[PDB]
Each structure stands twice: as structure tokens, then as C-alpha cells.
Paper text:
Transcriptional regulator MtrR inhibits the expression of the multidrug efflux pump operon mtrCDE in the pathogenic bacterium Neisseria gonorrhoeae. A member of the ubiquitous TetR family, MtrR is entirely alpha helical and comprises a helix-turn-helix (HTH) DNA binding motif and a C-terminal ligand binding/dimerization domain.
The structure of MtrR bound to EST was determined at a resolution of 2.37 Å using de novo phasing by single wavelength anomalous dispersion after selenomethionine substitution of the protein. The stoichiometry of MtrR bound to EST, TES and NDR is 1 ligand:1 protomer. The alignment of MtrR-EST and MtrR-DNA structures reveals three major movements that result in the induction of the protein. The first movement is a 20.8° rotation of the DNA binding domain (α1 through α3), which shifts up and away from the DNA major groove in all MtrR-steroid structures. The second significant movement is a 10° rotation and 4.5 Å shift upward of helix α4. This translation of helix α4 coincides with the upward movement of the HTH domain, away from the DNA, as well as a widening of the ligand binding pocket in the induced form. Last, the flexibility in the loop formed by residues 114–122, between helices α6 and α7, allows a 17.2° outward rotation in helix α7. This movement also aids in the enlargement of the ligand binding pocket as well as a movement of residue W136, which is positioned to obstruct the entrance to the ligand binding pocket in the DNA bound form.
Residue numbers in the entry:
A (entry chain B): 10 to 77, 82 to 209
B (entry chain A): 9 to 75, 82 to 209
Write the structure that this text describes.
């Protein structure tokens, strides 16, 4: 509860001031913990961020058993569960808020950004594996262009998150995300321009 | 009106290298090789430079429309917008700043409000293209236009965001037309965008 208390203080501070303008010492103030104890648990600020990203991912994967007839069906559930969690889980809300809006791509953030890309590369391969299992079960056609489909998926879903935050949550994500996900899946299943 | 454009581009250039939050007027005026006062005459603050930059992006897009049916004109304008992102350094840098170097902190609050104003304008313009397209029967009378405009913007936002934040990992020239085609098809045919 010491290591956790520090990450939530990192998250709360990142959300307030942004990643670049946040210091390993002002995180200590929020957590109310000596810097040597902080250094005990994490080397530097990228570490706090890497742990926040890992917690987000753990939460998604831990629920996948509870989301799970067939794996392409599980994907649908996991996508829908993701967007509900954005609304109702304050940790996932703030973290994605930070990732899309509070993490500017300047040299000051270079190390944090490389951490983001490590986790996104893991997610990119998660998608490929799901597409691959789905072709094998014949939920997707055998000539599905998997490299293109992966860009299409990340593009479609990133766009909805970006739009939602940028608008200031000015539309109902609970009604809109299922429409968007519905259209996307239909396109992966049926549209010719995602075939090789 | 040519002094204004030189001050504007020094800001765009400085915003691109440092981001908006860390740029100061001093550095802009320096980059432009003019005094603080002379900059101040044309532009009071960074908000006003960013606003003018955003205004010039929109002017470029609108001027090229002026040179089929409007629903066909829309498709062409989406396609050319993404070509322009590759081949036009000002549209590249600007959208790079808007999506990657425009943090949503309190110091940037005024710039963000600027950005929302222009995004609102574009939303109204998209809403009109959909309204005209319906009456010309390029889209169905039953088209859910409120959802459709969210759908169009997040489709395009997603491409731009994904291309910039991945370090331009894929070829926008092959990807953008394929995304825009699929979008166009869904607007015309997908039943999720109706009723
Ligand atoms: C699509 C995203 C990457 C891939 C993620 C994934 C990847 C595999 C999987 O089985 C489920 C999910 C759900 C959340 C998805 C993410 C939501 C937004 C992000 O871009
Ligand atoms: C979707 C955007 C706003 C609406 C823009 C528009 C709005 C109306 C129109 O007739 C054409 C275009 C092309 C470019 C579009 C933009 C590309 C990026 C921007 O977010």
C-alpha cells in the first residue's frame, strides 16, 4: 500500500500538471513519503509511468476470463468493457486522459514516450493474435489483410478516445462506443478493402 | 500583411520545436528577428498566433474547394487534406503541434479554447455537408446526422493521431484513402448510422 499509494499520487499529479511539468519530488509530497522510500520502490519518473501503464493493462487482461462463446466474441466484449471502464473507473479515465492529452512529444518526455510505445507494441501484437485466432475459427476471411486490419482497429478506437476527450466528453460514450465498435467489426468481417 | 505571415511562421516553427507551452514570445520574436514590441503590435499573445495559424490551415482547405456534387467534393477534400499533411510543411507542422505538442494543462487553457472554437466551426461545416447530401439523396433521409458527424471526426482524428503518435510508422498515402473509402461506404450504407 506504499507502492500503490505512490502510483496514485503520480497519476493524480500527471493528471493535474502533465507528465513533463511533474517532478519525482512533488509526487513524494502527494504520497507523503520520503524520497529514499520513493527511490526504494522506483528508480525514476518513467518507472512510475511504466507501473501506471502496467496496472491499466493488468486490469484489462485480468477481466478477460470474466469477459469470456468464441474468441472473436471475447474481443467484442473486451472492447465494450474497455470503453465502459473509461467512463466508470477513475484510474483508467485519468490515465488515458494523460496519455492522449497530457503527454506532449518533446525531448523532455522522450523516455516516458518510449515506455508508452513498449506497451503499445505489446497491444499491437495482442490484436494480431486475436485476428490470427479469428481467421482460424473462420470469423474473419482467410485473405484478411492483418497488417492493415491492425492499423484500422487502432486507428478507429484511438479516434474515438481522442474525440471523446477533445470534445470534453461532450457525447455519451456509453451509447456511441457500441455503434463505433459495431461498425468496425462489421468492416473487419465483411468489407473488401480489408482483404489482401 | 506580409509582416504578419513572417511572424506567424516563426511561431509555427517555434511551436513545432518546443511545443506551445514552453514557447515564449521572446523566442518567437527572436526566430522572426524582430523586437518584442514589433511582434506585440501584430499579435498580443501566443493564443493569437495559434489562432491565426489555425485560421490559415482552414483558409487553405476552403480556398482549394473553390478550385460532381458536393458529396463528391467532400470525398475529394478529405483525400486532399491527407495528401497535404505529407507534402505541405505548414500543414504537417501545424497538425503535429495540435495533436502532439498541445498539452491540456491550465497554462494552455486559452490555446485549447482557441482549438475548440475552430473544431466547432469544422463540425458545423461537416453537419452542413451531411444536410445537403441528404437532400440531394447522396445519403439516406434516415441518416442519424448527430452520430454521423461524431463518426466522421473520430475516423479522421484517429488516422491523424495514429500516424503522428506512432512516428509516421505507416504510409499515409496508402492508408488514408482506404480508411476514407470505408468511412464513405458506412455513411452511405451502414444501418448503424440511421434512425
Ligand atoms: C484498441 C486498443 C489496443 C488493443 C486493446 C486490446 C487488445 C487485445 C484484446 O484482446 C483486447 C483489447 C482491448 C483494449 C484494446 C485497446 C483500446 C484502445 C487501444 O488503441
Ligand atoms: C476532420 C477535420 C475537420 C473537418 C474538415 C472538413 C470539413 C468540411 C469539409 O467540406 C472538408 C473537410 C476536410 C478536412 C476535415 C478535417 C481534417 C482534420 C480535422 O479534424
Amino acid at each position: 500500500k506504499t507502492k500503490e499509494h505512490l502510483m496514485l499520487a503520480a497519476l493524480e499529479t500527471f493528471y493535474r500538471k502533465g507528465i513533463a511539468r511533474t517532478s519525482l519530488n512533488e509526487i513524494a509530497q502527494a504520497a507523503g513519503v520520503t524520497r529514499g522510500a520513493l527511490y526504494w520502490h522506483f528508480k525514476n519518473k518513467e518507472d512510475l509511468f511504466d507501473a501506471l501503464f502496467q496496472r491499466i493493462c493488468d486490469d484489462i487482461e485480468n477481466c478477460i476470463a470474466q469477459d469470456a462463446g468464441g474468441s472473436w466474441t471475447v474481443f467484442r466484449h473486451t472492447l465494450l468493457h474497455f470503453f465502459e471502464r473509461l467512463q466508470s473507473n477513475d484510474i483508467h479515465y485519468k490515465f488515458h486522459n494523460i496519455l492522449f492529452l497530457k503527454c506532449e512529444h518533446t525531448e523532455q518526455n522522450a523516455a516516458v514516450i518510449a515506455i508508452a510505445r513498449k506497451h503499445q507494441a505489446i497491444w499491437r501484437e495482442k490484436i494480431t493474435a486475436v485476428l490470427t485466432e479469428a481467421v482460424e475459427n473462420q470469423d474473419l476471411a482467410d485473405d484478411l489483410d492483418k497488417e492493415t486490419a491492425v492499423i484500422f482497429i487502432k486507428s478507429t478506437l484511438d479516434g474515438l478516445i481522442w474525440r471523446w476527450f477533445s470534445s470534453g466528453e461532450s457525447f455519451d460514450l456509453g451509447k456511441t462506443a457500441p455503434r463505433i465498435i459495431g461498425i468496425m467489426m462489421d468492416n473487419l468481417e465483411n468489407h473488401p478493402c480489408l482483404r489482401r
